[PDB]
Amino acid sequence: AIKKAHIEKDFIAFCSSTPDNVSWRHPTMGSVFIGRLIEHMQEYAASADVEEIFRKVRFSFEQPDGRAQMPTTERVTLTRAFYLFPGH
Amino acid sequence: AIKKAHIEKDFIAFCSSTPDNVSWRHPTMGSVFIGRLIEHMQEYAASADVEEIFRKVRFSFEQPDGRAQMPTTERVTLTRAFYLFPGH
Amino acid sequence: EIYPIMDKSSRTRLALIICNEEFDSIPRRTGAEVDITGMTMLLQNLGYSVDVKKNLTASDMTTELEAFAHRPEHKTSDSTFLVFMSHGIREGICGKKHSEQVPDILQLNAIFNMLNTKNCPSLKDKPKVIIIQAARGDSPGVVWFKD
Amino acid sequence: EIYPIMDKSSRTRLALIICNEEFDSIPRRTGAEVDITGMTMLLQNLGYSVDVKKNLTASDMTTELEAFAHRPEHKTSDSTFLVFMSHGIREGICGKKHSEQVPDILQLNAIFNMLNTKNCPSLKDKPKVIIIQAARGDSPGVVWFKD
Ligand SMILES: *SCCNC(=O)c1cc2c(C(F)(F)F)nn(C)c2s1
Ligand SMILES: *SCCNC(=O)c1cc2c(C(F)(F)F)nn(C)c2s1
User: Fold this and answer.
1) For position C89, which CATH number holds?
2) C123: region left, alpha or beta (phi > 0 left; psi from -120 to 50 alpha)
3) Which residue of chain D has the CA closest to B62?
4) Residue D98 belongs to what domain range?
5) Which residues pair with D19 in a beta bridge?
6) Signal peptide location in the record (chains A, B)?
């Protein structure tokens, strides 16, 4: 049996195009991009899909005050909505 | 008065990476990518946001039968959800 | 958490469609007129004033997009639509005078740098939808599998 | 219209984190250990088995990603996560032996061509999340405006 299948499908890239250079004060400090991502991944995992979670990360970075960050979601090839389902 | 503002913000690109060459039969036929986009833009305009509409276009192209198409949403920089609101 | 829409009574929504069908060396894009008619009618029903441009070079596409960003209509608008319809390669959108020996390509990065906050302050905090149609030189994106 | 999740009792979720902090010429990425600890703990709580790789060249990143695609764990999995953490330029992710004179870049297009259906049939119809961290050589993405 044979069936057609897309070569590139079910992809989602979430990358920060904005620079994230190391600070002079607190050199061992964690990344603001990585940190904010995890914070949203913990609270909104059992309520929203990953594509919608990335939007919440973008919405939180709407007003610049500390590090200027604005990540872009690229090559979205997800046909459906991907819910993580914590503990399932 | 002065305020900080992101250089690249509130963007959404919806482009077809898959080839859309002209057919030998019916040379003046409209594009399947453009056609399917409009069909979803007409029915789901007063119910879903554009980013979610593009997903419905991707979901409709999940199984290849005619022209093999799978568009990718790129450089998503939308902080909020953009609803079109027809006739408002 | 939704983008604020502008009142219909006093708004100036503006959209741009750049389509290339007639070329100098690369194959003709026949049936593109149906794509233009379809998109223009759609966007106009959504409230956007549509500007249609036919058969332009990469240099002409840069100037037309730069002129579109500095339009006073965007000041009293809430959103915009950009439609590109032509041949596509690894870099981006092909122009009308594009050939194998002499390249004429409008880069995708230049489009985003044109409607960005720095070069286009009128569309700040406003959704910018860029629909591109680019037929690439790679075999139909389908692979068979045994099941 | 939701991606079908696999039962927790009999699933083998797998994730890969490739981080670069120590370099030969380009500046050190100090504080990256916090990013590794944070992401590994997160993904493991989500059910993913995390493989962590430290300080690799573009050639080493290609082989490691190719080996990750052919893992038998993906056959009994429902999703995957890929995390890249290094310096970034116009092309993509920088390697450990990357310099101004001698370039060592892992292209972003190669990552998608590695986990695609043709080269990775095990992750067909399964969500593939690729989180990249790339600090680019362009002044902080902020512009002032008069209001
Ligand atoms: S992870 C962020 C890196 N981004 C890219 O690799 C590029 C994305 C694009 C586009 C887009 F399609 F988004 F418009 N155009 N170019 C030239 C690039 S590079
Ligand atoms: S409109 C489709 C054209 N796409 C692009 O211009 C490119 C997007 C990317 C990426 C991505 F960030 F998505 F991974 N990486 N490269 C090298 C490109 S080109």
Assistant:
1) 3.40.50.1460
2) alpha
3) D125
4) 4-136
5) D54, D85
6) none
